[PDB]
Amino acid sequence: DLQNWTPRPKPERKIFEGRYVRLEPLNAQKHGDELFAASSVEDAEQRFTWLFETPPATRAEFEPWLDKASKSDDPLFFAVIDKASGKVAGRQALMRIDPANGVIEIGSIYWGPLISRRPAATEAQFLFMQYVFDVLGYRRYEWECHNENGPSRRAAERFGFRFEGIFRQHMVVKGRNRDTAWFSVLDSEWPALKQAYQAWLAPENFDSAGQQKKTLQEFRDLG
Amino acid sequence: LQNWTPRPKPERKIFEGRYVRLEPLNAQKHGDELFAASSVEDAEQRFTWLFETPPATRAEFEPWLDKASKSDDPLFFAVIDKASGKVAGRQALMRIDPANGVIEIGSIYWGPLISRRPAATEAQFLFMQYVFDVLGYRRYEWECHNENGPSRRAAERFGFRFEGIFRQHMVVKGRNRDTAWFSVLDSEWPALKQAYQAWLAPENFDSAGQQKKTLQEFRDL
């Protein structure tokens, strides 16, 4: 197939609608107030530890980052809207976009308390992965995080990304060394992942308290 | 790293060694000699894993040469073999990250005047010294096609440490490329510098031009 390979399309500012979550292209006027709220919760400092940004101290102080992020084409930012509340719950981006080789990254992730460790967060990831493979036809979908960011590494593994390696001294972030852990999902890996996510996200998989009956790793194991 | 700042960008300057001289690539100055070196009998084998194909004619070489001469990233240098006096190959500093002090040595073409001779090792050394002792960078990268055995071996010999393979990283010349990644850290450089100095010293080569000890032997010390 690869002798005829040509560049794939660039990602677009599209709306993505799921059962638990909605993704909207980030817009300062539409999302600014609620994203500020999400980004300035009581434990925002802890939540932002490994991110490139620090939490905004005031709404006015948030505006410059918000405007740059809303206008940016790479990273391409989306607000993550929790459907149950209708509120912006976080943000994420498609980034390091390489249409020529069909390679792209999900990064710039902040999933706040409304969605963190709930089905909405898993579906936010899923909707990007689905778009990247089924619509854009990319070959390689990346996750990178600080190697010391345990929750992010475990999130990547749970999501089905495969570890590739650690770039030693890859960055300096907030006055500290960052070795970067890299993981990927290949186009050949996507179809089995898609089935496992769809099974996990199904309303059948959540009891009346909203608690999962089986985990995402369990469904992936089941094949 | 509380005090860490962005580092300077690399600049077009001349780097003068014992065996090799690196000059900022210039179409008029280097084009005819570099084309000659790039159209040697085994140019096809030498270009296999490069992004470029070997140039069939001087005219057909001009677009790549002009673009490479003007490029700021990759930032290209002609590799002049001092003994012969000829342009013998080319190489670049690339994927320049001043904020984090990360940079790659890449787009390496070393022709038969210097490949597997001390000049090639020195060509690598002069970039490595510039990156660490002058620019103050903290991570120096090498990447290649995973099936490029000679490049993987060269990176390991030169002291770069394997970090991993990016699967399906590129499509190159109609085929899949998984990319193998290697690095040298600033913390590793002072000891590595000494090993290169020992290896490149004239005293390490006998009257027949053969090394007495290998680069890897000096690195073990």
Coordinates of C-alpha atoms in Angstrom, one line a residue:
Chain A
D1 CA 0.0 0.0 0.0
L2 CA 2.8 2.4 1.0
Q3 CA 4.2 2.9 -2.5
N4 CA 1.0 5.0 -3.2
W5 CA 0.9 6.8 0.1
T6 CA 0.2 10.5 0.0
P7 CA -0.3 13.2 2.6
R8 CA -3.4 12.9 4.8
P9 CA -5.7 15.8 5.5
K10 CA -5.0 18.3 8.3
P11 CA -7.4 18.1 11.4
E12 CA -10.3 20.7 11.3
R13 CA -12.2 22.7 13.9
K14 CA -15.1 20.2 14.0
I15 CA -17.7 19.6 16.8
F16 CA -17.4 16.0 18.2
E17 CA -20.5 14.6 20.1
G18 CA -20.4 11.6 22.3
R19 CA -22.7 10.1 25.0
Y20 CA -20.9 11.7 28.0
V21 CA -18.9 14.5 26.5
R22 CA -18.9 17.1 23.7
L23 CA -15.7 18.6 22.1
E24 CA -15.9 22.1 20.7
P25 CA -13.1 24.0 18.9
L26 CA -11.8 26.3 21.7
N27 CA -13.4 29.8 21.6
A28 CA -12.5 32.5 24.1
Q29 CA -15.9 34.1 24.3
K30 CA -17.9 30.8 24.4
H31 CA -15.6 28.8 26.7
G32 CA -13.5 31.3 28.6
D33 CA -15.5 31.8 31.8
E34 CA -16.3 28.1 32.3
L35 CA -12.8 27.0 31.4
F36 CA -11.4 29.5 33.8
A37 CA -13.7 28.0 36.5
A38 CA -12.5 24.5 35.7
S39 CA -8.8 25.7 35.7
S40 CA -9.0 27.5 39.0
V41 CA -10.7 24.8 41.2
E42 CA -9.4 24.4 44.8
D43 CA -6.8 21.8 43.8
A44 CA -5.9 23.3 40.5
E45 CA -2.2 23.6 41.5
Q46 CA -1.9 19.9 42.0
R47 CA -3.8 19.2 38.7
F48 CA -1.5 21.5 36.7
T49 CA 1.8 20.2 38.2
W50 CA 2.9 18.4 35.0
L51 CA 1.3 20.7 32.5
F52 CA 3.2 23.4 30.7
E53 CA 0.8 26.0 32.1
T54 CA 0.2 27.1 35.7
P55 CA -3.4 27.7 36.9
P56 CA -4.8 31.2 36.2
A57 CA -4.9 33.3 39.4
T58 CA -7.8 35.5 38.0
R59 CA -10.1 35.5 35.0
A60 CA -8.3 38.5 33.5
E61 CA -5.0 36.8 33.9
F62 CA -6.3 33.7 31.9
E63 CA -7.2 35.7 28.8
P64 CA -3.8 35.8 27.1
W65 CA -3.4 32.0 27.2
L66 CA -7.0 31.5 26.3
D67 CA -6.8 33.8 23.2
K68 CA -3.6 32.3 22.0
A69 CA -4.9 28.7 22.5
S70 CA -8.2 29.5 20.7
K71 CA -6.4 31.0 17.7
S72 CA -3.6 28.3 17.5
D73 CA -3.6 25.8 14.7
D74 CA -1.0 23.6 16.3
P75 CA -1.8 22.7 19.0
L76 CA -5.4 22.7 17.8
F77 CA -7.4 23.2 21.0
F78 CA -10.9 21.9 21.9
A79 CA -13.0 22.6 25.0
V80 CA -14.2 19.4 26.6
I81 CA -17.8 19.8 27.7
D82 CA -19.3 17.5 30.3
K83 CA -22.7 16.7 28.9
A84 CA -24.3 15.9 32.2
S85 CA -23.7 19.4 33.6
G86 CA -23.5 21.2 30.2
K87 CA -20.3 22.9 31.6
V88 CA -16.8 23.1 30.1
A89 CA -14.8 20.6 32.2
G90 CA -11.4 20.9 30.6
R91 CA -9.5 21.2 27.3
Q92 CA -7.2 19.1 25.0
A93 CA -5.5 19.4 21.6
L94 CA -4.4 17.6 18.5
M95 CA -0.8 18.7 18.1
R96 CA 2.6 18.0 16.5
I97 CA 0.5 17.5 13.3
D98 CA 2.3 15.7 10.5
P99 CA 0.0 15.2 7.6
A100 CA 2.8 14.1 5.2
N101 CA 3.5 11.0 7.3
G102 CA 0.0 10.7 9.0
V103 CA 1.4 11.3 12.5
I104 CA -0.3 13.3 15.2
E105 CA -0.4 13.7 19.0
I106 CA -3.2 14.1 21.6
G107 CA -1.7 16.5 24.2
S108 CA -2.2 19.7 26.1
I109 CA -4.7 17.7 28.2
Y110 CA -6.4 19.2 31.2
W111 CA -9.4 17.1 32.4
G112 CA -10.8 18.8 35.5
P113 CA -12.8 17.3 38.4
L114 CA -16.1 17.2 36.5
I115 CA -14.8 14.5 34.2
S116 CA -11.5 13.3 35.7
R117 CA -11.7 9.5 36.1
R118 CA -15.3 9.4 34.7
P119 CA -16.5 8.1 31.4
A120 CA -16.5 11.6 29.8
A121 CA -12.6 11.7 30.1
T122 CA -12.3 8.3 28.4
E123 CA -14.7 9.4 25.7
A124 CA -12.8 12.7 25.1
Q125 CA -9.8 10.7 24.2
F126 CA -11.8 8.2 22.2
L127 CA -13.4 10.9 20.0
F128 CA -10.0 12.2 19.0
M129 CA -8.6 8.7 18.3
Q130 CA -11.6 7.8 16.2
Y131 CA -11.4 11.0 14.2
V132 CA -7.6 10.5 13.6
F133 CA -8.0 7.0 12.3
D134 CA -11.5 6.6 10.8
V135 CA -11.7 10.1 9.3
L136 CA -8.2 11.5 8.8
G137 CA -6.7 8.0 8.0
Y138 CA -3.5 8.6 10.0
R139 CA -0.9 5.9 10.7
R140 CA 0.4 6.8 14.2
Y141 CA -1.2 8.5 17.2
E142 CA 1.0 9.7 20.0
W143 CA 1.0 10.3 23.7
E144 CA 3.9 11.9 25.5
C145 CA 4.3 12.9 29.1
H146 CA 6.9 13.5 31.8
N147 CA 8.3 10.2 32.7
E148 CA 7.7 11.1 36.4
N149 CA 4.0 11.8 35.7
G150 CA 2.7 8.4 36.9
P151 CA -1.0 9.1 36.4
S152 CA -0.4 10.2 32.7
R153 CA 1.8 7.1 32.0
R154 CA -0.8 4.8 33.5
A155 CA -3.6 6.7 31.6
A156 CA -1.7 6.1 28.3
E157 CA -1.3 2.4 29.1
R158 CA -5.0 2.1 30.1
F159 CA -6.0 3.8 26.9
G160 CA -4.0 1.2 24.9
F161 CA -1.0 3.3 23.8
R162 CA 2.2 1.2 23.7
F163 CA 5.3 2.4 25.3
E164 CA 8.2 3.1 22.9
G165 CA 10.8 4.9 25.0
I166 CA 12.1 7.7 27.1
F167 CA 13.9 10.8 25.7
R168 CA 16.3 11.8 28.5
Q169 CA 16.5 15.6 29.2
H170 CA 13.9 16.2 26.5
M171 CA 12.6 19.4 28.1
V172 CA 13.0 21.8 31.0
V173 CA 9.6 22.6 32.4
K174 CA 9.0 25.0 35.3
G175 CA 12.6 24.9 36.4
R176 CA 12.8 21.0 36.4
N177 CA 14.2 18.4 34.2
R178 CA 11.7 16.4 32.0
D179 CA 12.5 13.0 30.6
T180 CA 9.7 12.3 28.1
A181 CA 8.0 8.9 28.0
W182 CA 6.6 8.2 24.5
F183 CA 3.7 5.9 23.6
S184 CA 1.8 5.2 20.4
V185 CA -1.2 3.6 18.8
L186 CA -0.8 2.4 15.2
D187 CA -3.5 2.2 12.6
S188 CA -3.2 -1.6 12.8
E189 CA -3.9 -1.5 16.5
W190 CA -7.0 0.8 16.3
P191 CA -9.7 -1.6 15.2
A192 CA -9.3 -3.8 18.4
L193 CA -9.1 -0.7 20.5
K194 CA -12.2 0.8 19.0
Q195 CA -14.2 -2.4 19.9
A196 CA -12.9 -2.3 23.5
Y197 CA -13.7 1.4 24.0
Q198 CA -17.2 1.0 22.5
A199 CA -17.9 -1.9 24.8
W200 CA -16.6 0.0 27.9
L201 CA -18.5 3.2 27.0
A202 CA -21.8 1.4 26.4
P203 CA -24.5 2.3 29.0
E204 CA -24.8 -1.5 29.7
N205 CA -21.4 -1.2 31.4
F206 CA -22.5 1.2 34.2
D207 CA -24.8 0.4 37.1
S208 CA -27.4 2.7 38.6
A209 CA -24.7 4.5 40.6
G210 CA -22.8 5.2 37.4
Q211 CA -20.0 2.8 38.4
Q212 CA -18.3 0.7 35.8
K213 CA -19.0 -3.0 35.7
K214 CA -15.7 -3.9 33.9
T215 CA -12.6 -1.8 33.3
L216 CA -11.2 -0.6 30.0
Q217 CA -8.2 -2.8 30.5
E218 CA -10.5 -5.8 31.1
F219 CA -12.3 -5.2 27.8
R220 CA -9.0 -4.9 26.0
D221 CA -7.9 -8.2 27.5
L222 CA -11.1 -9.8 26.4
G223 CA -10.7 -8.9 22.8
Chain B
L1 CA 17.3 23.8 36.6
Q2 CA 15.8 26.8 38.3
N3 CA 18.2 29.0 36.4
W4 CA 17.8 27.4 33.0
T5 CA 17.2 29.8 30.1
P6 CA 16.8 29.3 26.4
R7 CA 20.1 28.7 24.6
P8 CA 21.4 30.5 21.4
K9 CA 20.6 29.2 17.9
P10 CA 23.5 27.7 16.0
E11 CA 25.2 30.0 13.6
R12 CA 26.9 29.8 10.2
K13 CA 30.6 29.7 11.2
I14 CA 33.6 27.7 10.2
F15 CA 34.8 24.7 12.4
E16 CA 38.5 23.8 11.9
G17 CA 39.8 20.5 13.0
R18 CA 42.9 18.4 12.6
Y19 CA 41.4 16.3 9.8
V20 CA 38.3 18.1 8.6
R21 CA 37.0 21.6 8.1
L22 CA 33.2 22.3 8.3
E23 CA 32.0 25.3 6.2
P24 CA 28.4 26.6 6.0
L25 CA 27.0 25.1 2.9
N26 CA 27.2 27.3 -0.2
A27 CA 26.0 26.3 -3.6
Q28 CA 28.6 28.3 -5.6
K29 CA 31.5 27.4 -3.4
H30 CA 30.8 23.7 -2.7
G31 CA 28.3 22.6 -5.4
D32 CA 30.7 21.1 -8.0
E33 CA 32.8 19.2 -5.5
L34 CA 29.9 18.1 -3.4
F35 CA 28.1 16.9 -6.5
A36 CA 31.2 14.9 -7.4
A37 CA 31.3 13.3 -4.0
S38 CA 27.5 12.7 -4.2
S39 CA 27.8 10.9 -7.6
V40 CA 30.4 8.3 -6.7
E41 CA 30.1 4.7 -7.9
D42 CA 28.3 3.6 -4.7
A43 CA 26.1 6.7 -4.3
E44 CA 23.0 4.6 -4.5
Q45 CA 24.0 2.4 -1.5
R46 CA 25.2 5.6 0.4
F47 CA 21.9 7.3 -0.1
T48 CA 19.6 4.3 0.7
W49 CA 18.3 5.6 4.0
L50 CA 18.7 9.3 3.4
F51 CA 15.7 11.4 2.5
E52 CA 17.4 12.5 -0.7
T53 CA 18.1 10.4 -3.8
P54 CA 21.6 10.5 -5.4
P55 CA 21.8 13.3 -8.0
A56 CA 22.1 12.0 -11.5
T57 CA 23.5 15.3 -12.8
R58 CA 24.9 18.5 -11.5
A59 CA 21.8 20.4 -12.8
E60 CA 19.4 18.0 -11.1
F61 CA 21.4 18.5 -7.9
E62 CA 20.8 22.3 -7.9
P63 CA 17.4 22.5 -6.2
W64 CA 18.4 20.4 -3.2
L65 CA 21.7 22.2 -3.0
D66 CA 20.2 25.7 -3.2
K67 CA 17.4 24.9 -0.6
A68 CA 20.0 23.2 1.7
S69 CA 22.4 26.2 1.4
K70 CA 19.7 28.7 2.4
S71 CA 18.0 26.5 5.1
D72 CA 18.2 27.6 8.8
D73 CA 16.8 24.2 9.9
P74 CA 18.5 21.9 8.9
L75 CA 21.5 24.1 9.1
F76 CA 23.9 22.5 6.6
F77 CA 27.7 22.3 6.4
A78 CA 30.0 21.1 3.8
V79 CA 32.6 18.6 5.2
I80 CA 36.0 19.4 3.7
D81 CA 38.6 16.6 4.0
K82 CA 41.8 18.6 4.9
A83 CA 44.3 16.1 3.4
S84 CA 42.8 16.0 0.0
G85 CA 41.4 19.5 0.3
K86 CA 38.1 18.4 -1.2
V87 CA 34.5 18.6 -0.2
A88 CA 33.8 15.1 0.9
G89 CA 30.3 15.2 2.2
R90 CA 27.7 17.2 4.2
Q91 CA 25.9 17.3 7.5
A92 CA 23.5 19.4 9.5
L93 CA 22.4 20.7 12.9
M94 CA 18.6 20.4 12.9
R95 CA 15.4 20.1 14.8
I96 CA 16.7 23.0 16.8
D97 CA 15.0 23.6 20.2
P98 CA 16.6 26.6 21.8
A99 CA 14.1 26.8 24.7
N100 CA 15.0 23.3 25.9
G101 CA 18.6 23.1 24.6
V102 CA 17.9 20.1 22.3
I103 CA 19.4 19.7 18.8
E104 CA 20.1 16.9 16.4
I105 CA 23.0 16.0 14.1
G106 CA 21.5 14.8 10.9
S107 CA 21.3 14.7 7.2
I108 CA 24.7 13.1 7.2
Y109 CA 26.3 12.2 3.9
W110 CA 29.9 11.2 4.2
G111 CA 31.5 10.2 1.0
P112 CA 34.4 7.8 0.3
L113 CA 37.2 10.3 1.1
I114 CA 36.2 10.3 4.8
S115 CA 33.7 7.5 5.6
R116 CA 35.3 5.1 8.1
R117 CA 38.3 7.4 8.4
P118 CA 39.3 9.8 11.3
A119 CA 37.8 12.8 9.4
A120 CA 34.3 11.4 9.8
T121 CA 34.7 11.0 13.5
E122 CA 36.1 14.5 13.8
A123 CA 33.2 15.9 11.7
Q124 CA 30.8 14.6 14.4
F125 CA 33.2 15.8 17.2
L126 CA 33.3 19.4 15.9
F127 CA 29.5 19.6 16.0
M128 CA 29.3 17.9 19.4
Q129 CA 31.9 20.3 20.9
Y130 CA 30.0 23.4 19.5
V131 CA 26.6 22.2 20.8
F132 CA 27.9 21.5 24.4
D133 CA 30.9 23.9 25.0
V134 CA 29.7 26.9 23.0
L135 CA 25.9 26.8 22.7
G136 CA 25.4 25.2 26.1
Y137 CA 22.8 22.6 24.9
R138 CA 21.7 19.7 27.2
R139 CA 20.5 17.0 24.8
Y140 CA 22.2 16.0 21.5
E141 CA 20.1 13.7 19.3
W142 CA 20.8 11.1 16.6
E143 CA 17.9 9.5 14.7
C144 CA 17.8 7.1 11.8
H145 CA 15.7 4.5 10.0
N146 CA 15.6 1.5 12.2
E147 CA 16.9 -0.7 9.3
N148 CA 19.9 1.6 8.8
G149 CA 22.4 -0.7 10.6
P150 CA 25.5 1.4 9.7
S151 CA 23.9 4.6 11.2
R152 CA 22.8 2.7 14.4
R153 CA 26.3 1.3 14.8
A154 CA 27.9 4.7 14.2
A155 CA 25.6 6.4 16.8
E156 CA 26.5 3.8 19.4
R157 CA 30.2 4.0 18.6
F158 CA 30.1 7.8 18.9
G159 CA 28.6 7.4 22.4
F160 CA 24.9 8.1 21.7
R161 CA 22.6 6.0 23.9
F162 CA 19.6 4.2 22.4
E163 CA 16.3 5.4 23.7
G164 CA 13.7 3.6 21.6
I165 CA 11.9 3.3 18.3
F166 CA 9.0 5.3 17.0
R167 CA 6.9 2.9 15.1
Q168 CA 5.5 4.0 11.8
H169 CA 7.1 7.4 12.3
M170 CA 7.5 8.2 8.6
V171 CA 6.8 7.0 5.0
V172 CA 10.1 7.5 3.1
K173 CA 10.6 6.5 -0.6
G174 CA 7.4 4.5 -0.6
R175 CA 8.2 2.4 2.4
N176 CA 7.5 2.4 6.2
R177 CA 10.1 3.9 8.5
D178 CA 10.3 3.2 12.2
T179 CA 12.8 5.7 13.6
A180 CA 15.5 4.7 16.1
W181 CA 16.4 7.4 18.6
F182 CA 19.7 8.0 20.4
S183 CA 21.1 10.8 22.6
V184 CA 24.1 12.2 24.4
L185 CA 23.5 14.3 27.5
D186 CA 25.5 17.4 28.6
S187 CA 26.4 15.4 31.8
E188 CA 28.0 12.7 29.5
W189 CA 30.0 15.2 27.4
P190 CA 33.0 16.0 29.6
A191 CA 34.1 12.3 29.7
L192 CA 33.2 11.7 26.1
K193 CA 35.2 14.7 24.9
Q194 CA 38.3 13.2 26.4
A195 CA 37.7 9.9 24.7
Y196 CA 37.4 11.6 21.3
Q197 CA 40.6 13.7 22.0
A198 CA 42.5 10.5 22.8
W199 CA 41.2 8.7 19.7
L200 CA 41.8 11.5 17.3
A201 CA 45.4 12.2 18.5
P202 CA 48.0 11.4 15.8
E203 CA 49.7 9.2 18.3
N204 CA 46.8 6.8 18.1
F205 CA 47.5 6.0 14.4
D206 CA 50.4 3.8 13.3
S207 CA 52.6 4.5 10.2
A208 CA 50.0 2.6 8.0
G209 CA 47.2 5.0 9.3
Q210 CA 45.6 2.2 11.4
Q211 CA 44.2 3.1 14.8
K212 CA 46.0 1.6 17.8
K213 CA 43.0 1.7 20.0
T214 CA 39.3 2.1 19.1
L215 CA 37.0 5.0 20.1
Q216 CA 35.0 2.5 22.2
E217 CA 38.2 1.4 24.1
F218 CA 38.9 5.0 25.0
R219 CA 35.3 5.5 26.1
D220 CA 35.7 2.5 28.5
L221 CA 38.6 4.4 30.2

